[PDB]
Each structure stands twice: as C-alpha cells, then as structure tokens.
Amino acid sequence: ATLDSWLSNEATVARTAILNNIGADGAWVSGADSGIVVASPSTDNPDYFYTWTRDSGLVLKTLVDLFRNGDTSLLSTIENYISAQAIVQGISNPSGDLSSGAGLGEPKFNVDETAYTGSWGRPQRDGPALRATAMIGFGQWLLDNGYTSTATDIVWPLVRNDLSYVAQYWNQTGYDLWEEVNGSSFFTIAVQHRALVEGSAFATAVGSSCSWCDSQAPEILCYLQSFWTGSFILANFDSSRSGKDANTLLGSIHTFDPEAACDDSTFQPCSPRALANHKEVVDSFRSIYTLNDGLSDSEAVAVGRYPEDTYYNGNPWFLCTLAAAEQLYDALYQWDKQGSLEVTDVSLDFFKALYSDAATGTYSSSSSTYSSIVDAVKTFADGFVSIVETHAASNGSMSEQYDKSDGEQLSARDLTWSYAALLTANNRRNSVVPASWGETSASSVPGTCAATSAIGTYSSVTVTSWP
C-alpha cells in the first residue's frame, strides 16, 4: 500500500534509464559502443564515463531476468552486450592479456573498447564471475528455445574464458567491490562460487565440460565459511575495519537461489548468518548519519557502504539501501516457499528489534508468530524503499549516494547500478525471482580447505556472424 504507487512507476523509469546508459543508441551516452554499459553518464565531478565489468554484469543479470520473465524486447540490447564482451575480453590491459588469463580481472575500460591505462585498484576478480553469471542465464534461454549454435559457438566460449579465469585466480589476492581494499573480499568469493556451479551445469548443457569448475567450487565454498565471525560476515580479510559492509548484503542477494533453504553454508538471505549479518551491518549506520536521528531499531534507516567510508564524506547509497530491502524480500519469499521461519540464537536480535515478542523457535506459515513477524519484516523492508523514494528526484532519477545530514543526491548522477538495484528489489517484493543456479547440490562444506588452483583454456571469440 505505502509505496506501490511509486515503485511500479519508478520501475518503468529504471528500465529506460538503463537503456539510455547503454550505447550505441542510449540517450545519455553518445560515444559509447553497441553493448557497452556506461556506469554513469557524468563525465567529471565525478568522471564515471567508463564501463566497469562488475557494473555491466550486475545490470545485465537484471536485464536477463526481465527478458526471461517475458520482456523479450530486450533481445538486441542483451545480444549487443555479448558481442561487446567478445571484443572486451580480448583487450590487453594493465592487468594482462586474454591469452594470459589475468586481465579479465581488469576493473574497467573506456566506452570505445580501449584499455584504461591509468592507475586503478586492479585487479578485481568479481567481474569474470559476475559476467559469466549474466551470460549463463541468457545461454539457458537460448538452449530452452532452440538456438543451440548461438548457445554453443558464441555464448559458451565467452563463458569458458571467464570460468577458466575464476578457477585459476580465485585464491590469489585483489581489490574489493568498492575498489579500495586489497585482499580477499566476501562478495567476490560468494559470486565466484556461484559462477563455477551454474557454469558447470550450463557447460554440461551445451554438450561440453567444465572440469575446473567442479574441482574448485567446493574449495571456494570451503574458503567461504571462514568469512563468518560468529557475530556477522567479514567484508574483507586484511582490514582494520569492523568488517561490517554492504558487500555482504550484496553477496547474499546476488547468490540468492529460489529452490534453496536457509543454508548457512552458502549464506542465503533467510539463513541465520545473513540474518544476523543484516542486523549487524544495518545497525552500523544508525547513529553516524544525522539523516537517521530518531529512527528506532524497529524502523528502517538510510544505509551506506560501510561506516569507515570517507568518500564524499561517506554517505548512504541507494543500491546499498535497496540491498537492505532486497535480502528481506528474498527472506520473505523463502519463508513462504518453505512454510517455515526458524528463529535461532544466532538470528534472535534480528527478529527481536522488529517483533518484541520474538523468541527461539520454528514457526510455520499457519502460526500466529509467522504472521506477525512477516508483517514486521515487510514493513521494515518497505521502510528502506520509502527512504529511497524520499531522496529520489522529481523525474525518478537516482544518483550513487545521497547526503548524510539532509539527503540530497551526491556523486555520479544516473548511476546505472542504482536502477538495477531498484528493478531487482521491486521484483522480489512482487515475488519475481531468477532461475536457480544449483545451490541444492552445492551446499556441502568439504573436509579440508585446499589453497589450490585449476586451469581452463583461454580463446578469443570473433563476432563471426549471426546464425
């Protein structure tokens, strides 16, 4: 009731906003190539006129989701991005060459498909996974509508390069999703795990093999366990920060599997760890912003990246505020699809701050307890999006961040990611979900975590024809 009017109307502007940010024929990005997702049109203060593989990948996943839920008009925009990545994967850069393997870690490029040869927090090893993920799902659609040549000769060998990457380089160090902390990032490892699992499944589906996907996936999932502290999920290893970061919120929602239970080992949205993490991570912003003064632990607050952040002084982020909501909406989906809502001693505070009478127990859909909690949850999540609404522009625009005291838009305008974050949260509020990646099978923690690698092949896809 309280935001549907705005959500559905905003979601319309979000779709078109993304398309204006993708060349060659996007309104706000003249000079960009066909299928290059510019992160933001802003060309100074700040100059975001580039194309980040991460940003490109998270957006295209969202576009693939929509496309498969019946928005078939996205076909050319999605395709165009496939042909773009063909050229992009082969751009030799400060991080490396394509035949090397390294340099699929290259955080960003120019909009004309040329390397960025300036200093940058490189490499970031999330990108290759995040691309393969976005591509894989459109591969599945191609298969399940009989376009096998495009699925086998164009889509697979792009996804083969990125899979080859993740298996080889995962256990080596690199910079986080915020481009700041050199180490091992949770988000990075989470989204990398998903890629080899769903990439193995998809590579089997084109009459082929991803032998390296298989060996390493449990090893990454083995490593992943270590990020849990008991209290919450650590953002990065090798950091003097608290470890509370939106990083982890995003790791959950972008590895959310619908055919899956509240599994602590893959850190799903309804899992005790991610639930505890949401309590901890969101709390960490309560007092540090003047914008959130007089907003109790039952109500929602403007959410940032992390409390140690000093970038633009360190404000609330729209996509991060939208991530707080999205985990909760995936939680509400998974409790519905289960017919259960386990309160554990781990999660306890998460519920207790929203539902005063919350306590340790399993409570099915039928119970009084479930009904009261999911109202409180729905309201809490609805709370964040209401804050997103408030500081969103009159014509529906969203920036990267919004001021810490008074909430005005700050940093890069028309951030492509912000719109994708909106399109995703809104979807999950209306029970719209993405195809499973195979979590059911990939939940067993191994015996011992082996700091190892495995190798693939690396081969350059030419944009040959269109079958």
Ligand X SMILES: *[C@H]1O[C@H](CO)[C@@H](O)[C@H](O)[C@@H]1O
Ligand Y SMILES: *[C@@H]1O[C@H](CO)[C@@H](O[C@@H]2O[C@H](CO)[C@@H](O)[C@H](O)[C@H]2NC(C)=O)[C@H](O)[C@H]1NC(C)=O
List, in sequence order, every residue forming a beta bridge with 236; answer none if it has no partner. Answer: 185
From ligand Y, ligand X, ligand NAG, none, interface partner of 359 (C-beta below 5 to 8 A by class): none
**What residues make contact with ligand NAG under the rule CB under 6 A?**
13, 17, 393, 395-397, 414
**Residues 396, 310 contacting (CB under 8 angstroms):** no
Counting every residue, how long is the chain? 467
Catalytic residue among 176, 264, 309, 382: 176
Position 383 contacts ligand X (CB under 6 A): no
Per partner kind, with CB cut-offs from 5 to 8 A, the member of ligand Y, ligand NAG, ligand X, none near residue 226 is: ligand Y
Smaller CB separation from ligand NAG, 32 or 196: 32
Given candidates 237, 312, 453, 459, which one binds ligand Y under the rule CB under 6 A? 237
Q: Binding partner of residue 149 among ligand X, ligand Y, ligand NAG, none, CB under 5 to 8 Å per kind?
A: none
Q: Which of positions 259-298 make contact with ligand X (CB under 6 A)?
A: none
* Alpha carbon distance 28, 367 (integer Å): 51
The mark string for 83-122 relative to ligand Y (x by CB under 6 A, - otherwise) is ----------------------------------------
Of the pair 1, 451, the CB lying nearest ligand Y is at 451
173 touches ligand Y (CB under 6 A): yes
Q: How far is it, in rounded angstroms, from Cα 201 to Cα 136?
A: 10
The one-letter code for the residue type at 77 is T
Angle between helices 416-429 and 318-338 (to 10 degrees): 20
Q: Is the preceding peptide bond at 269 cis, omega within 30 degrees of 0? A: no
Q: Look-up: residue for tokens 């935001």?
A: 3
Task: Count the Cβ atoms, other than its own, within 10 Å of residue 394.
Answer: 5
Beta bridge partners of 51: 109
- Residue selected from 90, 94, 96, 121 as contacting ligand X according to rule CB under 6 A: 90
Buried b (16+ CB within 10 A) or exposed e, 356-388: eebeeeebeeeeebbebbbebbebbbbbbbbbb
Instruction: Check residue 446 for interaction with ligand Y (CB under 6 A).
Output: no
Q: How far is the CB of 161 from ligand X (least distance, A)?
A: 8
Nearest-10 Cα torsion for 164, 166, 168, 173: 150
Query: What type of residue is 73?
Result: S
Applying CB under 6 A, among 223, 306, 317, 335 the residue interacting with ligand Y is: 223
Q: Choosing among ligand NAG, ligand X, ligand Y, none, which partner's interface includes residue 449 (Cβ < 5 to 8 Å by kind)?
A: ligand Y
Q: Out of 211, 446, 460, 467, which residue is the one contacting ligand X (CB under 6 A)?
A: 460
By CB under 6 A, residue 157 contacts ligand X: yes
Could you give the residue ranges of the DSSP H alpha helices within 21-52? Answer: none
Give whole-number Cα distances, 368 to 67, 337, 365, 371, 375, in Å: 38, 18, 8, 5, 11
H or E element in which residue 108 lies:
strand 108-109
Any known ligand binding at 170? no
**Residue in 25, 79, 97, 179 annotated catalytic:** 179
Phi, psi of 13 (to 5 degrees): -70, -30
What's the maximum distance between 2 C-alpha atoms anywhere in the chain? 63
Residue number, 215 or 397, with CB nearest to ligand NAG = 397
Helix (H, G, I), strand (E, B) or coil at 362: strand
The item of ligand Y, ligand X, ligand NAG, none sharing an interface with residue 397, based on CB under 5 to 8 Å by kind, is ligand NAG
Chosen from ligand Y, ligand NAG, ligand X, none, partner binding at 75 (C-beta under 5 to 8 Å by type)? none
User: Hey, which residues between 400 and 459 contact ligand X (CB under 6 A)?
Assistant: 459
Q: Can you state the angle between helices 53-68 and 126-143, rounded to 10 degrees? A: 20
176 as an active site residue: the answer is yes
- The region of 24-32, 34-42, 86-94, 285-293 touching ligand X under the rule CB under 6 A is 86-94
Does 87 bind ligand X (CB under 6 A)? Our answer is: yes
Q: Would you please indicate which residues are annotated as catalytic (active-site) residues?
A: 176, 179
Instruction: Note the residues at the interface with ligand Y (CB under 6 A).
Output: 171, 173, 184, 219, 223, 226, 237, 449-451
Point out the annotated binding site for substrate.
Answer: 120
